[PDB]
Scaffold this motif. Structure first.
Motif, PDB file in Angstrom:
ATOM      1  N   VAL A  18       0.854  -1.184   0.000  1.00  0.00           N
ATOM      2  CA  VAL A  18       0.000   0.000   0.000  1.00  0.00           C
ATOM      3  C   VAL A  18       0.892   1.238   0.000  1.00  0.00           C
ATOM      4  O   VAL A  18       1.937   1.257   0.669  1.00  0.00           O
ATOM      5  CB  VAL A  18      -0.973  -0.021   1.192  1.00  0.00           C
TER       6      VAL A  18
ATOM      7  N   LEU B 194       1.446   3.915   1.610  1.00  0.00           N
ATOM      8  CA  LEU B 194       1.206   4.641   2.851  1.00  0.00           C
ATOM      9  C   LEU B 194       2.551   5.108   3.388  1.00  0.00           C
ATOM     10  O   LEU B 194       3.394   4.285   3.771  1.00  0.00           O
ATOM     11  CB  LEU B 194       0.491   3.762   3.873  1.00  0.00           C
TER      12      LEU B 194
ATOM     13  N   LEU C  36     -11.708  -5.871  16.407  1.00  0.00           N
ATOM     14  CA  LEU C  36     -11.621  -4.437  16.170  1.00  0.00           C
ATOM     15  C   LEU C  36     -12.654  -3.686  16.992  1.00  0.00           C
ATOM     16  O   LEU C  36     -12.337  -2.666  17.616  1.00  0.00           O
ATOM     17  CB  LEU C  36     -11.808  -4.138  14.685  1.00  0.00           C
TER      18      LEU C  36
ATOM     19  N   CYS D  31     -12.120  -0.746  19.756  1.00  0.00           N
ATOM     20  CA  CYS D  31     -12.811   0.539  19.715  1.00  0.00           C
ATOM     21  C   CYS D  31     -13.726   0.749  20.918  1.00  0.00           C
ATOM     22  O   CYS D  31     -14.110   1.890  21.195  1.00  0.00           O
ATOM     23  CB  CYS D  31     -13.600   0.655  18.413  1.00  0.00           C
TER      24      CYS D  31
ATOM     25  N   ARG E 275      -3.790  -1.868  12.603  1.00  0.00           N
ATOM     26  CA  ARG E 275      -3.094  -2.034  11.331  1.00  0.00           C
ATOM     27  C   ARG E 275      -2.629  -0.688  10.785  1.00  0.00           C
ATOM     28  O   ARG E 275      -3.359   0.304  10.828  1.00  0.00           O
ATOM     29  CB  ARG E 275      -3.995  -2.748  10.321  1.00  0.00           C
ATOM     30  N   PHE E 276      -1.367  -0.649  10.360  1.00  0.00           N
ATOM     31  CA  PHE E 276      -0.707   0.490   9.730  1.00  0.00           C
ATOM     32  C   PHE E 276      -0.381   1.624  10.690  1.00  0.00           C
ATOM     33  O   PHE E 276       0.012   2.704  10.241  1.00  0.00           O
ATOM     34  CB  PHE E 276      -1.523   1.042   8.568  1.00  0.00           C
TER      35      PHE E 276
ATOM     36  N   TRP F  43     -11.893   1.865   7.956  1.00  0.00           N
ATOM     37  CA  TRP F  43     -10.974   0.870   8.507  1.00  0.00           C
ATOM     38  C   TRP F  43     -11.119   0.700  10.016  1.00  0.00           C
ATOM     39  O   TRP F  43     -10.546  -0.243  10.569  1.00  0.00           O
ATOM     40  CB  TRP F  43      -9.530   1.226   8.164  1.00  0.00           C
ATOM     41  N   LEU F  44     -11.877   1.564  10.686  1.00  0.00           N
ATOM     42  CA  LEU F  44     -12.182   1.372  12.095  1.00  0.00           C
ATOM     43  C   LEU F  44     -13.414   0.504  12.314  1.00  0.00           C
ATOM     44  O   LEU F  44     -13.792   0.268  13.465  1.00  0.00           O
ATOM     45  CB  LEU F  44     -12.353   2.723  12.784  1.00  0.00           C
TER      46      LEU F  44
ATOM     47  N   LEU G  84      -9.320  -2.960   5.438  1.00  0.00           N
ATOM     48  CA  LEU G  84      -9.217  -1.707   4.708  1.00  0.00           C
ATOM     49  C   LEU G  84      -7.972  -0.934   5.132  1.00  0.00           C
ATOM     50  O   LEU G  84      -7.459  -1.103   6.241  1.00  0.00           O
ATOM     51  CB  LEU G  84     -10.469  -0.856   4.937  1.00  0.00           C
ATOM     52  N   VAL G  85      -7.488  -0.087   4.230  1.00  0.00           N
ATOM     53  CA  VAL G  85      -6.269   0.685   4.471  1.00  0.00           C
ATOM     54  C   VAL G  85      -6.615   2.144   4.764  1.00  0.00           C
ATOM     55  O   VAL G  85      -7.515   2.714   4.129  1.00  0.00           O
ATOM     56  CB  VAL G  85      -5.290   0.541   3.291  1.00  0.00           C
ATOM     57  N   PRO G  86      -5.961   2.773   5.745  1.00  0.00           N
ATOM     58  CA  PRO G  86      -6.205   4.198   6.072  1.00  0.00           C
ATOM     59  C   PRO G  86      -5.505   5.145   5.106  1.00  0.00           C
ATOM     60  O   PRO G  86      -4.573   5.876   5.437  1.00  0.00           O
ATOM     61  CB  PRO G  86      -5.657   4.306   7.500  1.00  0.00           C
ATOM     62  N   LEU G  87      -5.961   5.136   3.865  1.00  0.00           N
ATOM     63  CA  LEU G  87      -5.388   5.940   2.797  1.00  0.00           C
ATOM     64  C   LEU G  87      -6.414   6.983   2.367  1.00  0.00           C
ATOM     65  O   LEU G  87      -7.503   6.625   1.908  1.00  0.00           O
ATOM     66  CB  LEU G  87      -4.981   5.035   1.637  1.00  0.00           C
TER      67      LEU G  87
END
Lengths: 551, 551, 551
Positions: B317, B319, B436, B440, B536-537, C310-311, C316-319
């Motif tokens: 990705v 990022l 997740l 949260c 993630r990330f 993504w939360l 999914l990617v935080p892009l």
């Protein structure tokens, strides 16, 4: 421009400062007595730019004890009076340089207001000015040294405005205003400190450390021209040049009890200075002098404008510097914007100044109410950093840390699309037009406009570090581009300036500033200044009224 | 692919190692004193791959005594600082190569952590780098050598992940991550040991023998990147590349008291590494650095990502590697999953960092409860070896014995029908989604997410050989693909880390680990590490919190 | 799963549709003139799901003729502009609902694009959206209804993807993307038709019958999101959500002359959709919007991603969704894969778009050659139905007949052993890596990568029924997971689009498509669309280039 690690770069900045400090000490030629007292002073300079040292409680008191009479007899003299001595040759240009260099070294240690001394070029300027005494004695500023903010270009120097990444940005030219002043017999002898991003009303950077107030070493010097306010508050320079886009001339001048003129945009050249957001024109910075001496502020203005700088800088208007002939005056008193109330010391200064004007027959004095001051933060919130602070954040690629004050300035910054700027330019021009109509509503039946408004520069005297969280009392006048002159009134008085009791804050931010003023003792000996506000290009009216207020 | 008898194959593997050990000693150019003292060190290398030697009680103490200051002055220096010396020409790339090669040889003997030296190509890389010094000192990792797990392809070498049957599987290419690091001024100089099947949290194989911990020679180095943990714990490499599918990067780093980052899948290229079950995608391995230097971990991540590796590996990705500007942090403490409680040394480490974070004003600290950790074993029990371990079991056609730890990993493996895999993929994604929401659920009323969780890497300090009977403290985050950074806290303290008194075990497996901890004396001087877990990330948040924990 | 007779179940599906149609007509509240004209429209709905009715020759003309100006003034307005009217209160949310509901009823009868209307919940959404106007006016999609493919879960509905055996599969939750859009002021009002197995580029199922093209009623709507393509081609919805695993978003969009985005996997949530082969991960579907309005596609993407999905969905990617800053563009033209050549209307569209890009100064235009397009079919032939289509075939236990198009998709499907899946996953990732190398081979001497490729969506305009026998022009980008945006260019011109004479087919399949294009009169008024292809996560570049092509 650079991406080396910031820790080594901060080293190079300290080395540049330290090598020039060495040469300055060589030029000043301390005797055994002064070298000893200088050696024993508490320092506001640390071993690295993150160590802020341990400043004196009252740096100005320590300065006056440490320096010899042979130095103070020159540096304490009003520069206009000192110009007479240089003209009549009772003192040489080199003697004046040696005295002020000695003064600036002591101020440097006590206050940390100098980024770089200029002793090599300063001696060269003064020697040839002495040699040319017969042909240049007639010049209006003959022999007078002055200080320049680090952001101002000078030949052979880096221009960084405090960002370590720009240490390789060396210029081969001076700023236009510097050359004009040199053409009139003056010369720069020191470069003063400025903080990161330039958008804080304090003076902390990773090029110099922390700059502190000249009257109380626990409080900030102000900013962005923090070094200038500090250096000139110690009377360690005849005058200095700063910049002002959010209060960066008037806030230092007010915090250090001296004079500072935010001149009207288009009167004196400032565009060749360096800052962030180069090419941004939505809100423009201006320059102007800071000095202990009102007469020197006026003389610097008179000197630069009478040199016709519009023949060098086409952004300027050919509007002469002319003393107003007014015999009667109408003056407004701006007691509060009703968002953040001023602390007791500022409030007393407003009363003192009110009573002094009322005691003279020729002043009519009215209360001046605010006009949508909340809109100032809204508009400037979009236009100060109109690229979403991308240009500033690119300076931190070195790893240079983000200071707390810098965060406030860039928080919420949007990267505006063209239409977004257009929307806010229209908001800006609309507000300017609305505010003018507000000002003119104070015209009397005979058609006499308000000549000036007297207002705070800040909700308080010199702030505690990391507490300058409200700008409107200066930035109001950047959004409008009105000329504003900060001027001294009084000092904190512990009996008269106790905190207000049974105070009910106006909002959360007013609560913060109320609690910031825990007792006058926290701000012992801090000057309480105010400012004179005028309509665009009425700068000289502010000088004339300030003249009356100090007599 | 090879079916010859395993004892011959183990021979060639030892010979490939032994020839490279020579060549490494020739390049290193020892002095008789070291070259002697080296001869007299206790060895973890035996006469054959089933003889595990007699390792030193504290290999690091022996390592520090054995090598000369001319070597330690380089290898003990933090690699980022050494990059300054490498940049300024205070040290040559070949000079650094000779030092670390010497270090790796001493470490090779003491911990049995080196599988094959690369001294020919390391000199070949390093010599042209001291040449174009003027052209590539600008590169972010100029001159720094590094270690690579044996599973990582390098030109002209066999890639076996410890399986003797793959000794003829020669590659003509480097891993993508290797080429990127070379393009940025680094080069690999040594290949580190990896165990059979790669699915053990220790490091025993029939290609190298047994690898042991850098701090206590009676315990395992960890695994599967056990060599990388040993070599970097012994401070014999600037950094290395490992792999982590069940804890195989964080366990070595935690067991050897250094830093190790399991980076989020899709940030750094890893697919061209070799393992068992090639083409298995249900649960994917990732790579990441191990080092004693947090700043060096961070610099490698930044270096590789800023090389835009998604333009070579389309799994990644785009990022950016971005340090957070966060001003406050909310952090959870994972004291236990309530299936296997941590031993006293880990339990005290949690208190240490809990109290350290609580003492800082800008951290909110809450207890973090587990979420169905039993489901990790259930799902990973089906997806780790989804072919019923057929691919691995075929490697033993050479007669290579099945190791006891490998036995645990392949027990119960099902050969999944497509519908069985689909069922467990759904179990995997639902658990990830359920977890997740659990994470949260710790967000506060103002909407600030949990930034990180602090958890053990293992129920204990570095384990005894053949005792790694619980994976969840690392494999939980492989199921979730969360980034996790192992980091140092403390070492075993014999007064504070006595066994728990009149303890009540939670289950048979908890009883096993309690009885494994007979006294702190069996784990003398063993580092007690913890880890930072992020969503993630958010790898970079983990680096920043780890930086604050060390000041 | 159900095992009742399919004829009974088809009844239950028709009844569900008809009951919602009755409620939809009540909500729309036709005056007698519209009820009359609606009643007399040729219907594409038959008496049962195997009777395909008698569609209009030009359904859009019939739609524009039938509906009153009071409806079309809303439904024909660009949705982003309509959002201004809803925000400023020139129109109510309930008013917009009534107009679009009426439009969809007319669209349903002409094209057979609706599986179930949602008038009860839609009125509840729109009414309380009006009641909460003051609090929700700021939302980016305030008041806008939208369509959802039947495969998308909605509270209280069966989710069948067209399979009758799943009529009892009722969900009590919405898909994540639906809830996100609702949180941003939107709401679904209608469910669109989907075909059997979803692995068809047409739209025939035993739940709804046959869906036809919005511009020519003798042609297919496309598939798998055929209802969405027909409904939004008729401008009877502001936008819709489909799914795309083999072209199932872009084929409907291209056949109906609108915009459709196959977004990069991992940007927006789709996993909670229902399809066949649940748990299969070798090739993953994506979702994305279909709309007449590029601005609406862009706003839907922008809205969902800025909600940080993504939360909720950890795949999914935080892009961020970011406008590209490039002002120059490099674009390749993919004229043919040299397996099946496009028909004249598609070739004219490629020339038109080539000429327009060449005429703008900031575009460099190059020819883009294929890379092993035969490899697309081989891999997808093994991975689309990796269980040998057992999961799909089991749906026919009801006796539901196997459609001809479905037959093609499941012909030859192997029930893969784990090692077979691993083999083809490696084939998949290698092809992806090879193709990236192919794409990067087009980078110029200056290092400027290809920004996008322009290609057909299909070898022809909207196909004749049961002729979509070639997928590669769309499925190539599912194997690669590249974002692809379908966009309008032109319509078939009977003068310009005569068949090629002396054409020599490339193979039997190219021969089939050549003879399929007998004359342009067989495709009257059919839109000729193309698509923009980008590398993974460059979705926004595609929107920006399509923006330039329409100005």
């Amino acid at each position: 421009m650079l991406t080396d690690n910031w820790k080594e770069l901060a080293g190079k900045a300290q080395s540049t400062f330290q090598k020039s400090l060495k040469q300055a000490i060589e030029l000043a030629d301390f005797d055994e007595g002064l070298a000893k007292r200088y050696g024993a002073l508490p320092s506001a300079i640390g071993a690295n730019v993150e160590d802020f040292g341990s400043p004196a409680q009252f740096p100005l008191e320590e300065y006056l004890k440490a320096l010899p009479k042979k130095v103070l007899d020159i540096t304490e003299k009003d520069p206009v009076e000192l110009l007479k001595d240089l003209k009549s040759r009772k003192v040489t240009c080199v003697e004046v340089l040696k005295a002020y260099t000695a003064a600036s070294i002591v101020a440097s240690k006590l206050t940390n207001c100098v980024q770089e001394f200029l002793p090599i070029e300063a001696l060269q300027y003064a020697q040839k000015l002495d040699a040319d005494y017969e042909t240049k004695k007639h010049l209006p500023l003959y022999g007078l040294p002055f200080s320049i903010k680090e952001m101002i270009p000078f030949v052979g120097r880096s221009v960084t405005h405090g960002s370590l990444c720009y240490l390789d940005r060396i210029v081969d030219y001076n700023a236009d205003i510097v050359n004009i002043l040199i053409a009139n017999g003056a010369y720069p002898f020191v470069r003063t400190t400025n903080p990161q991003s330039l958008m804080m009303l304090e003076c902390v950077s990773f090029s110099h450390g922390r700059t502190v107030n000249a009257y109380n070493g626990m409080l900030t010097s102000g900013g962005s021209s923090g070094g200038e306010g500090a250096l000139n508050g110690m009377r360690a320079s005849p005058f200095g040049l700063g910049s002002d886009i959010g209060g960066s001339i008037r806030c230092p001048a007010a915090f250090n009890g001296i004079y500072g003129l935010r001149s009207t945009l288009g009167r004196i050249p400032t565009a060749d200075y360096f800052s962030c957001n180069r090419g941004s024109e939505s809100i423009l910075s201006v320059t102007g002098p800071l000095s202990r001496s009102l007469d020197t502020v006026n003389l610097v203005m008179k000197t630069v404008i009478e040199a016709k700088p519009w023949l060098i800088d086409p952004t300027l208007v050919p509007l002469d510097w002319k003393r107003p002939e007014n015999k009667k005056f109408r003056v407004g008193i701006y007691v509060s914007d009703h968002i953040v109330n001023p602390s007791p010391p500022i409030n007393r200064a407003l009363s003192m100044v009110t009573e002094k004007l009322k005691s003279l027959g020729n002043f009519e004095v009215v209360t001046f109410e605010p006009y949508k001051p909340e809109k100032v933060t809204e508009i400037l919130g979009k236009l100060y950093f109109e690229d979403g602070a991308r240009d500033f954040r690119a300076t931190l690629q070195t790893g240079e840390p983000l200071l707390e004050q810098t965060r406030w300035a860039i928080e919420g910054a949007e990267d505006l699309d063209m239409h977004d700027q257009w929307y806010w330019n229209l908001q800006k021009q609309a507000y300017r037009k609305e505010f003018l109509k507000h000002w003119c509503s104070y015209t009397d039946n005979d058609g006499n406009v308000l000549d000036a408004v007297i207002a705070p520069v800040f909700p308080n005297v010199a702030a505690k570090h990391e507490t300058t969280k409200y700008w409107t009392y200066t930035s109001q006048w950047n959004l409008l581009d009105y000329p504003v002159l900060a001027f001294p009134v009084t000092k904190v008085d512990e009996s008269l300036d106790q905190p207000y009791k049974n105070y009910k804050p106006l909002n959360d931010l007013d609560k913060y500033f109320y609690e910031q003023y825990d007792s006058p003792s926290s701000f012992k000996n801090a000057p309480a200044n105010l400012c004179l506000v005028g309509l665009r290009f009425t700068d000289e009216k502010l000088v004339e009224i300030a003249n009356i207020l100090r007599n």
